[PDB]
């Protein structure tokens, strides 16, 4: 049996993956053969080699049971490799992971704390909806204990069992009682994580948990006043992992309370001013402070300071800080709506940035920034931006322009003009789900239909190879061709509409293969609705319907027959069922 380092040195000498697979399967057969001998000496290094083969992405499904034979061993190294292989090879949906339950339950009552450490490790990493229903009665036994090394593991295991089983947090309310006075800080960190989860899940636990706010206020104040600790220190900063979790627990509390909001006023006024802003860690502290300020009903003087912090963040040359500032402004859109808007030039400057993430957050922030007063100005810049994107930004921008324009439109004509400009400039990027929204809004329009249909007809004669354009246009023609062609039952003086190329452009949509077989359903619906809406030229589109009933698509062949039966038998019933469609919300 070879060692692990020999296998890794052998795999690194393979050049082609069609040779590396061979050097994998060579040793993989030896691992399988050593598993059929039921070994107990070399089984550690075999399961280690098998985890290495899994880490590349080769099949390690057979080595699942031999992790379970290592978990139920008695040496420590085998238990270590067994729980590591349990956390790698096994998950919820493997269904051989029910066998770990008895071994973990016997290893939580183990004498040495490190076997209990590995058993809390595995159950915290990868417990399921059924393992945690039979183990949380034993984790709370390990939560009342006095071993400071295992309190921090039992707390995060409780976090995992509350995240997987949300109907199980009620047995931790008599388990979490008065464990925030811990002198050790790792236990305090995991207990703040546990309180964060307990306060995030059920609001009925908040009333017992917002009473302990001035305790952790005093704890965070003692953290800030302690300028140095020998451990916990990253560039002169006292335990930032604890401070961010305490500030997040302060954020999720007091957001609809006032007593706790007045309680947390002093330390939030302090740490927003009494912090270091040089390294990345102080920026993390200050950003979590900003998010703590923005979600709570704080003092009115604090929010001006927080907007000043974010205005400092917008001007930094570090792109991390720009991403943090755009994220933070994207958070507090609704609360403090007006003071965000004065950074508009800085946000629009971020649309010109050379990064995918910065332009994406600037796009989202600009779409959240549109109100009913900056609507006429900011849409011009966003419509200039939309033509000047990458091909990945046009889809979300075409969605967001429609979403912002449906909320805050100043008028109806300019709204349709902007949507039409988007449809002419996006084309093959606007999402197909937006087409019911576009047709629903232009039929919510009751006063301007001819101005829409003339421009749609002028647009699709330019091109037809944009799918959502003709998706809108065929419906628009089929419902409002009477406002397209008016009073032209026979041949008259030459106007732009001619009631013959209107039908010919739909026939060209049908014949040309730049159609995804859903524009053709719209097209035939338009053709048949131009039998009642048009008294000018009928019995010629009847030819186009009747020659279409042999098409290879299923629904088009159904639809052409279900129209041709009306054209040939029930011409007195064609007008009897083509009344205009009612309009909903």
């Amino acid at each position: 049996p070879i060692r692990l380092r020999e296998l890794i040195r052998t795999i690194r000498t393979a050049r082609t993956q069609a040779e590396e697979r061979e050097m994998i399967q060579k040793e993989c057969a030896a691992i399988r053969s050593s598993f059929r001998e039921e070994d107990n000496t070399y089984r550690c290094r075999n399961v280690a080699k098998l985890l290495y083969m899994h880490m590349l992405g080769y099949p390690a499904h057979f080595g699942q049971l031999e992790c379970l034979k290592l978990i139920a061993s008695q040496k420590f190294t085998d238990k270590r490799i067994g729980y590591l292989g349990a956390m790698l090879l096994l998950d919820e949906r493997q269904d051989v992971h029910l066998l770990m339950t008895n071994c973990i339950k016997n290893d939580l009552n183990h004498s040495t704390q490190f076997v209990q450490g590995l058993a809390l490790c595995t159950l915290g990493c990868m417990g399921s909806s059924e393992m945690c229903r039979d183990l949380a009665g034993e984790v709370e036994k390990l939560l009342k204990t006095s071993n400071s090394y295992l309190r921090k593991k039992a707390a995060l295991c409780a976090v995992h069992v509350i995240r997987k089983v949300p109907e199980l947090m009620e047995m931790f309310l008599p388990a979490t009682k008065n464990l925030l006075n811990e002198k050790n800080h790792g236990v305090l960190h995991t207990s703040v994580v546990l309180l964060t989860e307990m306060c995030e899940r059920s609001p009925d636990m908040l009333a017992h948990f917002r009473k302990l706010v001035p305790q952790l206020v005093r704890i965070l104040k003692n953290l800030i006043m302690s300028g140095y600790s020998p451990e916990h220190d990253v560039s002169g900063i006292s335990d930032p992992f604890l401070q961010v979790r305490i500030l997040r627990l302060l954020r999720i509390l007091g957001r609809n309370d006032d007593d706790s909001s007045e309680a947390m006023n002093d330390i939030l006024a302090q740490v927003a001013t009494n912090t270091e802003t040089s390294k990345n860690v102080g920026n993390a502290i200050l950003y979590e402070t900003v998010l703590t300020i923005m979600d709570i009903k704080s003092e009115s003087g604090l929010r001006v300071l927080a907007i000043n912090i974010l205005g400092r963040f917008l001007l930094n040359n570090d792109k991390n800080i720009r991403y943090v500032a755009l994220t933070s402004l994207l958070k507090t859109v609704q609360t403090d709506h007006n003071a965000v808007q004065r950074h508009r030039s800085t946000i629009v400057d971020c649309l010109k940035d050379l990064d995918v993430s910065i332009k994406r957050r600037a796009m989202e922030l600009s779409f959240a920034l549109v109100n009913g007063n900056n609507i006429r100005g900011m849409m011009k810049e966003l419509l200039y931006f939309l033509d000047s994107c990458e091909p990945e930004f046009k889809a979300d921008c075409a969605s967001g322009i429609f979403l912002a324009a449906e909320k805050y439109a100043p008028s109806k004509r300019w709204h349709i003009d902007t949507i039409m400009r988007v449809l002419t400039t996006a084309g093959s990027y606007v999402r197909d789900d937006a087409v019911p929204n576009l047709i629903q809004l232009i039929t919510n329009s009751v006063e301007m239909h001819a101005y829409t249909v003339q421009r749609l007809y002028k647009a699709i004669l330019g091109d037809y190879s944009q799918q959502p354009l003709v998706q809108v246009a065929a419906w628009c023609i089929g419902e409002y061709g009477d406002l397209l062609v008016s009073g032209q039952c026979e041949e008259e003086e030459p106007i732009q509409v001619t009631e013959d190329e209107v039908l010919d452009i739909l026939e060209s949509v049908l014949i040309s293969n730049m159609s995804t077989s859903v524009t053709r359903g719209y097209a035939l619906t338009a053709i048949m609705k131009l039998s009642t809406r048009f008294t000018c030229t009928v019995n010629r589109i009847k030819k186009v319907v009747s020659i279409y009933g042999s098409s290879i698509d299923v629904e088009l062949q159904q639809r052409a027959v279900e129209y041709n039966a009306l054209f040939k038998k029930y011409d007195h019933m064609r007008s009897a069922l083509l009344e205009r469609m009612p309009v909903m919300e």
Binding site: R15, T16, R36, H61
Partner: protein, 415 residues
Amino acid sequence: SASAVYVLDLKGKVLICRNYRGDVDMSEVEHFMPILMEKEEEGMLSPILAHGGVRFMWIKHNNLYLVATSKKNACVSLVFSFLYKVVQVFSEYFKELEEESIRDNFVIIYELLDELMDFGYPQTTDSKILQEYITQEAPRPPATVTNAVSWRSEGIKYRKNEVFLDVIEAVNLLVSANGNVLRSEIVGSIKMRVFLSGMPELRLGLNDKVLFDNTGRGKSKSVELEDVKFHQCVRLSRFENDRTISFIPPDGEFELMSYRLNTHVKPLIWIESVIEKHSHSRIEYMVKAKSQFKRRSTANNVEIHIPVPNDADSPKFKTTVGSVKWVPENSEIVWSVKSFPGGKEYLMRAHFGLPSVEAEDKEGKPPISVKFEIPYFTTSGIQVRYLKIIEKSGYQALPWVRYITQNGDYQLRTQ
């Protein structure tokens, strides 16, 4: 109509490059390997990749990609036959062609890529003639490079005059799971090794069925050569006239003709295999191999591959004749028989386990594919009759032949 003969490695960087027309930029090969890795993960892999107006005709050697870019409507088969002839020229100068041969012999490889092709057109690719003024060890170009007989340099003189022939058969076979023969054709290839002095005009003679029907001997054993692909050297108009094989041979080993006919005869080695694949438990292979051919012949060093599952374990091999090694790289057993006489019938029983936890993905069923070799025996029944050495000088050469039957893709499908 190639544009730039590139030679890459498995990482995609340029081992050596040689453009001729300049219609393809030299940085266009940087779009080869990302496009190949994109087409690899959607099953639309092709030997002709596409980057806008630049198409990439490529073949895959051992570690090498010989990408030949083009921009216009290139003659594609010209480019691919050129690339395989470039492979043959490099493997005739170099004992192997790998990444260690390009960067260590760049003195001669740029000369070859300048000599073989100009402006995208192959013009002189016979490697043995090309050994005479492009050397790794310069005179005028020989007259053989320009003359009509462009594969034989006059002035070669040997001590003896030996004409070696290897009429090597290759049985292709495809037997379905039902036990019936779907396709059974023989792709034979007469492979000569000529050591002659002078400018000989050989006339090889076969037992062709058409030649005997136009002769008058239409009741003896004659092979119906359904198609014949001769070399360059064979006078093809004279062969289309009266089935006559007249040529001036090159100097050294070459493949003269590659005949191809069908077979209504039984398969040589038959593999009657059964599989008792019980789920989650084990698998049994009560396989036997009978030889349907004559009792006299002796199939040397056959290797009957049988594909096993991917995750088998603890093998047991109850055989009769011939050892079993188990190769888990290819995930198949190699039932190697050292000597397999005709008419015999050898039984072999393999027995694995199988993991009790079931697999995650499917497995696929490759065919049983033997690697047999039978000397002094032709399945097609082709018999060379004569070889008239014709030389202006006048001597007696010694024409030697030997008959070998091999496999091509001698596959037998499984259940």
